[PDB]
Amino acid sequence: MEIKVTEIRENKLLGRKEIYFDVLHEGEPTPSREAVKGKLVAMLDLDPNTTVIQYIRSYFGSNVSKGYAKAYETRERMLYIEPEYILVRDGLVQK
Amino acid sequence: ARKGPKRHLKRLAAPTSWYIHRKAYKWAVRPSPGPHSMKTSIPLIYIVRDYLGYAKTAREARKILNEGKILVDGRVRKDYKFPVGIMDVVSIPETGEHYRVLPNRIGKLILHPISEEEAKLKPFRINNKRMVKGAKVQLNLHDGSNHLVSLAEKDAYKTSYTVIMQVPERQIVKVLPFEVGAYVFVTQGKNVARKGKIVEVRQFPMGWPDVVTIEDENGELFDTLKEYAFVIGKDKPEISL
Amino acid sequence: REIGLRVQPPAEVCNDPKCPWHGNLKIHGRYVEGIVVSDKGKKTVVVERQYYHYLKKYERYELRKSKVHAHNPECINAKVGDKVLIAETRPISKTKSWVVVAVLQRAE
Amino acid sequence: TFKLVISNPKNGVAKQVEISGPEADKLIGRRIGEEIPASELGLNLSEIFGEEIPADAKLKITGGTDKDGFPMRPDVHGPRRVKILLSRGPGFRPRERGERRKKTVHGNTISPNIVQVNMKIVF
């Protein structure tokens, strides 16, 4: 699977880096959040924490999925801005 | 049957001056009473969320608003219902961004980016005059605001002139009159967002408003109403359009 | 007072406070011309005018009439047959909301 | 037969006792705002209230309750019942601003229809 960053965007008010990326998986299924996070952090020098994946989406026939990710400066601002359902869905918090 | 005032607003019934999706949902933010009208203003949350894109939901927008990270006319505004309007200035000092609110040739409101120097001035149109106790003159402006002046200098302020003012402290500079060579910016009607110079005024009897003719720099002439002709300069503009 | 219509005032005077000229009554809205049809009431006049309505299906016209009741001050004392000018004001009685301001042509 | 609740405005304590027989018939006909000696009924206060209360002390009728649970309202004359559409107290608790309800109250006079009688010690 390849991961190709299409856009990065900066937010000073909430203190976040928004990231739009494409995933290329020709012949394979839709990949997993763990793997996508590993690749993202390895490639952009980010913390495995303070990083969440809002969605990975597949289309009708593409073998090319899309993603949206957010990288925060501080775990505190993170837990304050982001709701709990994505945190549980990612694994950064135990319900 | 209705026993009182309204507190909701549906999206199919929202004014046309807005950039909004009408079928995505059923409900819209009803603005609160304030400076401008409903047909001439848009709340702040729509700016924070749908124009600039600093938030995707409304909780995030409320959160940034309740921390003084956004100003309007040099003042902090925490209410997501506050109506923003024409000739107003939106300032984000954490990103160095300054926008001025203006309409299009279509009638919709937009954000024109300006500089920090011009972000400290706001033009006002004198809409009426009154004499109040202490024998003082009260000018009633176009955003619903008011200014006090002495009697000695009453003949210098009339009911269509324009006044430039430092926004937060609200001190006057550079009055501009309504004459036959003044620069103009139309704010409503069929010829909205056009610009040009005045040529002729015309009056009518028994309640009908006054009309004015204007010439654009391509040389073409067009008429409109006198209350729609915002004065912004003498020979050239003082702000950015 | 010089009300905002650009007509000439009458060559009389009254004490009635319900006269646009000489009094405290103020006019606003629309103003039309008509002909007097009846003046059998005191300080009241019936004014009539006419227009054409268009029938879209039959491609032709239809003459229609319009009646109003107007206040009639004593400085401007119109009678049946006068061509007159009336203007709108606040409700004066159950059926009167217009007032006569000038007689344009007096009948014999 | 009456249950007397005798209260002292000195300490804030009250005691419940019974009265039956002819000493009870001395109350029927009496109203609210009228004073009565304690011996008139056949009981002394040092016996029951506790330590000691002087003699010469009389009792004041402040309220009462009918055998069906309807209280007495001073400003209603008679030993009978009424429905009056009152707006405050005694005998109703509003629970809202401008709320009114038609209630069932007993009158200003004592009658054999009563069970409870509230007395206040005078000094």
Place this chain on the structure above:
RNA sequence: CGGACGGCUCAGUAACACGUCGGUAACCUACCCUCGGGAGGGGGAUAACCCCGGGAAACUGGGGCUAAUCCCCCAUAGGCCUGAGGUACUGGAAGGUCCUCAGGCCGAAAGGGGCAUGCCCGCCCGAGGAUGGGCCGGCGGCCGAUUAGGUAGUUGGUGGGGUAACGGCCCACCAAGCCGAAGAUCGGUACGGGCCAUGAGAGUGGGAGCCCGGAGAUGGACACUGAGACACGGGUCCAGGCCCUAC
């Protein structure tokens, strides 16, 4: 503080109810914005809490103790009426606003709370706006003559009461007017529009679902509190129906 919004329905209504253009110089408006000004001095009660309870319940009594951004009172600002003058403002046009004088009625406020060694949220008055409403007007849109005369506060005037405000809205007095064959009155059916179905088009027919407006909350009538109700999940009565009961 809010619950007068939102949500449901189409009974009634042929009407300024609806649509559109205009008007209020004849009116009200808590939450909101701007500007200009103020927060002085005293008093009081009473829930919770404690003692004793009553009634089958629903509900409810007596005594003691206490606080407030609760309630009351003085003062000052200010609000309203009238009369005589000056003419500064707006406006197309002043029974309006401003200035001076005079005679009188009503009559504010919480410097409270938080952090801290000044900042945040707030209280009252005034002038204006916005939001939302009330009222008026011109035009426009069903069928019936085996329904032809109707109206008697009915049409107008003078003077007043009452309303937030104009007004026969109501009252006293003077007159005899108002609508009608270009169809009044009466009777029938029916929430009104944007819209929809059909047709080459003209045109015919409908108007439950989504939006704007109106009306109603078993039938009918009447009131309290509040900026706003004669109030679907708050009140009072009559009629008609049903339920619990220790009757």
